[PDB]
């Protein structure tokens, strides 16, 4: 509390969320991206739009948000508002009529090493080509392209957290069965 | 009586919301006692996901849950317990329901 209050005041005295959080401008920010599918809300065949409820786990290091726990009573991790810090601008490229970027700015888990974990929720409305030839015995391959809208790979690198999406907390659907899932 | 945004709040949200809305409808005000106890009673309009058992429709009964938890803080930071003041139930005021 008092230790964390002092730590937050120290961290955000001269902080800037404009520039990338790197020691050197020639360094690359590595952002681990992990998509968790919570729910398959709807498959819209007419408008070719799949609605999903997802958690977009993002992990990266901030060079300037580091501290020694011994100088602040042993605090090793804190929660801070995500609006105060630099974040990657991940955008759903195939967004159909929903939000392009994250709009629910939940808190980030910040470690003393500068490691950030940000896991905001989102409603992804994605544009998927629906093949209705075999309906209602039809199989649909529907994708979600994610990337940093304004940053290229030479300043911000993205890598999947895992080879597959996280379906551990996936609610069963009464209309669809997910045969396969994978992130490339 | 202090505005809720002025004090620390636990980030308790409806995890199983269906429309993407996690938060309360109106922040209102907390009631702070002299001993540091904070009571907050925000209103909420919630749309929660409920898997419908369709077998006996319309002569059916449903089991619709509202999962409430902190979105950020782990169990080592914020611990939850059922509210009472051994009444582990949703309170329905008979006159005004």
């Amino acid at each position: 509390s008092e230790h964390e209050t002092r730590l937050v005041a120290k961290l955000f005295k001269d902080y800037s969320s404009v520039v990338r959080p790197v020691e050197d401008h020639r360094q690359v920010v590595e952002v681990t991206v992990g998509l968790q599918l919570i729910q398959l809300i709807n498959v819209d065949e007419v408008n070719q739009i799949v609605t999903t409820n997802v958690r977009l786990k993002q992990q990266w290091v901030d060079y300037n948000l580091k501290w020694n726990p011994d100088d602040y009573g042993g605090v090793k991790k804190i929660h801070i508002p995500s609006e105060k810090i630099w974040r990657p601008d991940l955008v759903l490229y195939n967004n159909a009529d929903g939000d392009f970027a994250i709009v629910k700015f939940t808190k980030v888990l910040l470690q003393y090493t500068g490691h950030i974990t940000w896991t905001p929720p989102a409603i992804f409305k994605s544009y998927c080509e629906i093949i209705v030839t075999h309906f209602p015995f039809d199989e649909q391959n529907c994708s979600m392209k994610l990337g940093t809208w304004t940053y290229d790979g030479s300043v911000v690198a993205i890598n999947p957290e895992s080879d597959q999406p996280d379906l551990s907390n996936f609610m069963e659907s009464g209309e669809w069965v997910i045969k396969e899932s994978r992130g490339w | 009586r202090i505005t809720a945004e002025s004090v620390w709040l636990p980030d308790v949200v409806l995890l199983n919301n269906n429309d993407g809305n996690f938060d309360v409808a109106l922040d209102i005000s907390v009631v702070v006692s002299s001993d540091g106890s904070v009571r907050w009673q925000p209103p909420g309009i919630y749309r929660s996901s409920c898997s419908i058992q369709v077998t006996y429709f319309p002569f059916d009964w449903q089991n619709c849950t509202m999962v409430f938890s902190s979105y950020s803080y782990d169990s080592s930071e914020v611990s939850l317990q059922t509210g009472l003041g051994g009444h582990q139930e949703i309170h329905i005021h008979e006159g005004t329901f």
Binding site: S1, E2, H3, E4, T5, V8, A9, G73, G74, V75, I78, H79, I80, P81 | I2, E5, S6, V7, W8, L9, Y73, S76, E77, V78, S79
Partner: peptide, 28 residues
């Protein structure tokens, strides 16, 4: 109330609403 205003000023001096209340590290 002037007394209520003074009490509010006393309470919220150095208060950070983004910091979880924990007097010692490890307090839940």
């Amino acid at each position: 109330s002037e007394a209520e205003g003074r009490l509010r000023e006393k309470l919220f001096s150095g208060y950070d609403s983004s910091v979880r209340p924990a007097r010692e590290v490890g307090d839940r």
